[PDB]
Amino acid sequence: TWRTNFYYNDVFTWSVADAPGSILYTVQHSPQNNPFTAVLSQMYAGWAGGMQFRFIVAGSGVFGGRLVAAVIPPGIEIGPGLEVRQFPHVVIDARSLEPVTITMPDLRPNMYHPTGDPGLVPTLVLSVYNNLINPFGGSTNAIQVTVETRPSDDFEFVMIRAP
Amino acid sequence: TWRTNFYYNDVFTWSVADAPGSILYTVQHSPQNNPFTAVLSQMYAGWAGGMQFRFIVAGSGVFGGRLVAAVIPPGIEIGPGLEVRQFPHVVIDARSLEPVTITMPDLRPNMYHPTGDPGLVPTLVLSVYNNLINPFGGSTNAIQVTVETRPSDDFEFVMIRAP
After folding, report:
1. Backbone angles phi, psi at A25, to 5 degrees
2. Residues whose CB is less than 8 angstroms from the CB of residue B111 and which lie 6 or more positions away in sequence, other chains included
3. Which positions carry the signal peptide feature in this UniProt record (chains A, B) (predicted)?
């Protein structure tokens, strides 16, 4: 189905100008981060469970540099000097050919979350850990990173919404 | 589920001024006529099957008059002198206490219909057959008719839509 495949959600740019600690991508955990859960969330009041995010770095396994994708607990705001490796995180190397996937989990497995006004949910943040390096000639000094998502196996919608 | 219950879709007015042959309500057969199929139709390319429409006339079983609800084949346009009883139809009496339900069926059970640009689909039309009569004093000369829908048992969505 749609819930077993990853689907394109977004894209962001990573350039040699983005210094360590810069945040290049951020998103609150929500059904709006997948195009199918975004549709279905309009007919349910509640949801629960994780969402997987898969990043493909278009650096032809050649560029140097690294991002850290980290899951930030609710009501912690993240700055640019902010350490994130204390949070559940995965490292994304510019030279990797393969996709790197991170699970944004449900941090409150105790209570269904609203599909409406979200309350207190985790945030996914992607920050520069090592500077992007274009070895040798540019003039390509920026690359793109695609973001695709799929609901985790524990993702669910509940409570039909009164229309 | 949502597909077993009728849900409010719309409302229309019937007044003593509406003469026989007036059209008081009309709608193309479509998933947009139920609030749940309207949501789900955004993630599918195709659909098929019938939709039930239930009308409750708010005439306290007292007003005189009748409407005919008729299903009009595609590409027949209906005027106000237009006979409809040759089409599948049900009669709605102003004096009825109970709801009156009509099935708008899939007239092309041979081919899934698009949820997008609809092509050629039947139309539900409600026309005055006998004038609404307020016996005795008004000053209520108009009543409302609520419209509720539910997918028929053969209703289906197919072909996940490329987002």
Report:
1. -160, 135
2. none
3. none
Domain residues of chain B, as ranges?
1-163
- Way the structure was solved: X-ray
Q: How many CB pairs under 8 A join A and B?
A: 30
Measured at the CA of B158, the angle between CA B146 and CA B125, to 5 degrees, comes to 30
Q: Which residue of A has its CA nearest to B160?
A: A2
Is the Cα dihedral B79, B33, B149, B160 positive or negative?
positive
- d(C-alpha A47, C-alpha B26), whole Å: 37
Bridge partners, A24 (sequence order): none
List all residues 6 or more positions away from A144 whose beta carbon is below 8 Å from its beta carbon: A11, A12, A13, A14, A58
Q: Which helix (H) or strand (E) holds A157?
A: strand A156-160
Q: What residues in A contact B33, CB-CB < 8 Å?
A: none
Pick the closest to residue B40 from A40, A55, A84, A85 (CA basis): A40
Amino acid at site A12: F
**C-beta atoms of A2 and B42 within 8 A:** no
Is A19 in a helix, a strand, or coil?
Answer: coil
Copy the structure tokens of residue A159.
Answer: 């409570």
Q: Look up residue A125 and give its two tokens.
A: 């943040």
Top-level CATH class of A1-163?
A: mainly beta
Resolution of the entry in angstroms: 2.0
Q: What tokens appear for B76 in the block?
A: 């027949």
Interchain proximity A40–B43, CB inside 8 Å: yes
Give the CA dihedral A33, A37, A40, A44, nearest 10 degrees: -80
* CA distances, B138 to each of B13, B112, B129, B143, B145 (Å): 16, 49, 21, 11, 18
